[PDB]
Design an enzyme around this catalytic site. Sequence first.
Site, PDB file in Angstrom:
ATOM      1  CG  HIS A  73      57.020  39.321  39.847  1.00 48.72           C
ATOM      2  ND1 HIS A  73      57.693  40.192  39.926  1.00 48.72           N
ATOM      3  CD2 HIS A  73      55.773  40.778  40.160  1.00 48.72           C
ATOM      4  CE1 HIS A  73      57.600  41.403  39.874  1.00 48.72           C
ATOM      5  NE2 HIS A  73      55.846  41.667  39.279  1.00 48.72           N
ATOM      6  CG  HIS A 225      53.617  42.835  34.993  1.00 44.73           C
ATOM      7  ND1 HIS A 225      54.103  41.799  35.417  1.00 44.73           N
ATOM      8  CD2 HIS A 225      53.439  43.312  35.902  1.00 44.73           C
ATOM      9  CE1 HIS A 225      55.440  42.051  35.920  1.00 44.73           C
ATOM     10  NE2 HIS A 225      54.591  42.936  37.036  1.00 44.73           N
ATOM     11  CG  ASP A 229      51.819  43.218  39.153  1.00 42.06           C
ATOM     12  OD1 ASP A 229      52.533  42.306  39.301  1.00 42.06           O
ATOM     13  OD2 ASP A 229      52.125  44.161  38.723  1.00 42.06           O
ATOM     14  CG  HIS A 252      51.182  46.808  43.298  1.00 43.36           C
ATOM     15  ND1 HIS A 252      50.872  45.129  43.088  1.00 43.36           N
ATOM     16  CD2 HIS A 252      52.068  47.327  42.586  1.00 43.36           C
ATOM     17  CE1 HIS A 252      52.205  44.567  42.306  1.00 43.36           C
ATOM     18  NE2 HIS A 252      52.883  45.766  42.041  1.00 43.36           N
TER      19      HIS A 252
HETATM   20  O1  LIG Z   1      45.013  51.836  32.032  1.00 42.57           O
HETATM   21  C1  LIG Z   1      45.571  51.860  32.909  1.00 42.57           C
HETATM   22  C2  LIG Z   1      46.430  51.421  33.826  1.00 42.57           C
HETATM   23  C3  LIG Z   1      48.061  51.707  33.945  1.00 42.57           C
HETATM   24  N1  LIG Z   1      49.042  52.609  33.441  1.00 42.57           N
HETATM   25  C4  LIG Z   1      50.302  52.875  34.112  1.00 42.57           C
HETATM   26  O2  LIG Z   1      50.743  51.745  34.024  1.00 42.57           O
HETATM   27  C5  LIG Z   1      51.998  52.777  35.285  1.00 42.57           C
HETATM   28  C6  LIG Z   1      52.428  51.829  36.234  1.00 42.57           C
HETATM   29  O3  LIG Z   1      51.921  51.712  37.277  1.00 42.57           O
HETATM   30  P1  LIG Z   1      50.911  52.507  38.356  1.00 42.57           P
HETATM   31  O4  LIG Z   1      50.288  53.600  38.715  1.00 42.57           O
HETATM   32  O5  LIG Z   1      49.993  51.060  37.713  1.00 42.57           O
HETATM   33  O6  LIG Z   1      51.115  51.093  40.115  1.00 42.57           O
HETATM   34  P2  LIG Z   1      51.715  50.025  40.546  1.00 42.57           P
HETATM   35  O7  LIG Z   1      50.487  49.135  39.657  1.00 42.57           O
HETATM   36  O8  LIG Z   1      53.374  50.050  40.067  1.00 42.57           O
HETATM   37  O9  LIG Z   1      51.866  49.501  41.842  1.00 42.57           O
HETATM   38  C7  LIG Z   1      51.451  54.279  35.861  1.00 42.57           C
HETATM   39  O10 LIG Z   1      52.564  54.716  35.491  1.00 42.57           O
HETATM   40  C8  LIG Z   1      50.242  54.391  35.500  1.00 42.57           C
HETATM   41  O11 LIG Z   1      49.925  55.318  35.506  1.00 42.57           O
HETATM   42  C9  LIG Z   1      48.200  53.198  32.831  1.00 42.57           C
HETATM   43  O12 LIG Z   1      48.365  54.604  32.228  1.00 42.57           O
HETATM   44  N2  LIG Z   1      46.808  52.990  32.363  1.00 42.57           N
HETATM   45 ZN   LIG Z   2      54.499  45.262  40.682  1.00 45.78          ZN
HETATM   46 ZN   LIG Z   3      54.775  42.946  38.989  1.00 42.87          ZN
END
Ligand SMILES: O=c1ccn([C@@H]2O[C@H](COP(=O)(O)OP(=O)(O)O)[C@@H](O)[C@H]2O)c(=O)[nH]1
Ligand SMILES: [Zn+2]
Ligand SMILES: [Zn+2]
Lengths: 267, 267
Positions: A73, A225, A229, A252
Amino acid sequence: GLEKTVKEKLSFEGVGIHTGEYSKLIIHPEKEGTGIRFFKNGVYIPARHEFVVHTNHSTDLGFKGQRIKTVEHILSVLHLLEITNVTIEVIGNEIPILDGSGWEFYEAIRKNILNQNREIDYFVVEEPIIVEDEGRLIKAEPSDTLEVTYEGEFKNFLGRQKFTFVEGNEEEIVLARTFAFDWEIEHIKKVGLGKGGSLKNTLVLGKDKVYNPEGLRYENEPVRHKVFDLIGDLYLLGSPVKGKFYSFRGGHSLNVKLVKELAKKQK
Amino acid sequence: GLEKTVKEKLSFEGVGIHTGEYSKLIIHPEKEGTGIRFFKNGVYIPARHEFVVHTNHSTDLGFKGQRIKTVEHILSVLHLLEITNVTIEVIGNEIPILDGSGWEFYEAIRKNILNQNREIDYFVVEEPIIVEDEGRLIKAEPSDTLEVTYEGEFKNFLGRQKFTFVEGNEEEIVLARTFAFDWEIEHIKKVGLGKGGSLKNTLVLGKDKVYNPEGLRYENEPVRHKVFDLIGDLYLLGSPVKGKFYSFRGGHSLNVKLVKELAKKQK
Ligand SMILES: O=c1ccn([C@@H]2O[C@H](COP(=O)(O)OP(=O)(O)O)[C@@H](O)[C@H]2O)c(=O)[nH]1
Ligand SMILES: [Zn+2]
Ligand SMILES: [Zn+2]
Ligand SMILES: O=c1ccn([C@@H]2O[C@H](COP(=O)(O)OP(=O)(O)O)[C@@H](O)[C@H]2O)c(=O)[nH]1
Ligand SMILES: CCCCCCCCCCCCCCCC(=O)O
Ligand SMILES: CCCCCCCCCCCCCCCC(=O)O
Ligand SMILES: [Zn+2]
Ligand SMILES: [Zn+2]
Ligand SMILES: [Zn+2]
Ligand SMILES: [Zn+2]
Ligand SMILES: [Zn+2]
Ligand SMILES: [Zn+2]
Ligand SMILES: [Zn+2]
């Protein structure tokens, strides 16, 4: 654009979303050529991909035994305002999560920009590239401006949403908060993370409900968001980026993978 | 003609003839309707007469406490190439003097013109007009093309010379350098100017001698330069100019006076 730094020290403090611990930041001005770097216990950790050490639920940097969690962020805000020279002193093991977005950072830094005497040497995407990972996919291609589109496909009421950021629309993504689904809270907690999460810094979504009494700031706040990110992760390239990105379900982990891919192509 | 901007960022750096300080420019592309403007320390200074703040030995622009000296050469080149939309980022307090002419600017910009989707709205001299000042005199009258004639009367070997520029003869005035007489060097220096002048960026003439080892690029190089200067000053009208001008012994001070006169006549 010209390289920028801050007019004077800016500080922020609060709990870290993952450690649950209190921490503080002091953003220090730096001169042309310095770049963005963190300082913790006498160690400088450049805000570059070579220092990434963790990408699950946040982007963490580390060097010489010193680690700093959740730099996405603050780096995103810095990237968006094109702040290129600062030292981010960190008192703690993680960046304060604040309200979960980049609003506080954005407002403070925005009114303290100090232009310097050097043209920014942007990282420019020269050729098309794609990275995939079990459904997730990120695509990058040349562009005179920074354009980031994120397309999410959620297994809840959010369904399938996509949002596109374009230079000049900074204020549309800097208020979007971090979100989590109730069904993933046990996992996050179980794996040692999320110790500082609350409805005050996180948007908790159910299969068809929104626990935060205030609700969503935008019907698609979550993909905004994600865009936010990704902008922060892209700054790990070492300098402001110019390119067109499209992320489908990215996180990420994939953002960083793309970053190292672009970097490898000595671009 | 169609509005034009540059294909990509173009940068120039070097010493400023008056400040003696180092500076750099970064010419940025802009879209239709933008116009020509400078950017210094977070401030935009339009390349228009309302922002002129000094006209002795150079044309300086300023706004909100930000000043930029010697904008005549870069604006002249821009005017001649009909570049209408760009932001000239300035790192310093003055435009680099380079070799004293507009050659470097001309060559770089010339091969980076990008036509846009809008017809130029030229500033057209509608009726005859004259401005005088102790011997000096500038006359402007209607014309379908930009035609500028300068007639100089020097108290040295140059004697009485005149030169006429007509659309299409750009290359005849873009190499003519700025000149100074040895007998005025003490004055210029005394009044805080000329700190960066040298035989490398200025043609120094004596009562009957030419100090530069390379000599004159044209027997009448000085009046060609005056024509060059006037073209740049005319661009302060806000857009490419169409009119026939005749300047007898004019300088930036009178050029600007004429510009404000034409502007006042809501032309
Ligand atoms: O098209 C998408 C993108 C993200 N997510 C969900 O968003 C949440 C955030 O975690 P992510 O796996 O994206 O990792 P981060 O961005 O926190 O590293 C997770 O539960 C994902 O399964 C989802 O359901 N559909
Ligand atoms: Zn994050
Ligand atoms: Zn974030
Ligand atoms: O017909 C002319 C025009 C200009 N000059 C000289 O050219 C030099 C340049 O200074 P100027 O007054 O033109 O200032 P600027 O154009 O830089 O404002 C001065 O020494 C002038 O006296 C001259 O002798 N005869
Ligand atoms: C889904 C992606 C990631 C970022 C991690 C978000 C933090 C998870 C923490 C869960 C917050 C639970 C809210 C209630 C906490 C409480 O009442 O103390
Ligand atoms: C009239 C307008 C212009 C400003 C010109 C800058 C003046 C500086 C001139 C260069 C100084 C050269 C010193 C050597 C003198 C000599 O050889 O006679
Ligand atoms: Zn720039
Ligand atoms: Zn996990
Ligand atoms: Zn997560
Ligand atoms: Zn003077
Ligand atoms: Zn002069
Ligand atoms: Zn001048
Ligand atoms: Zn000149």
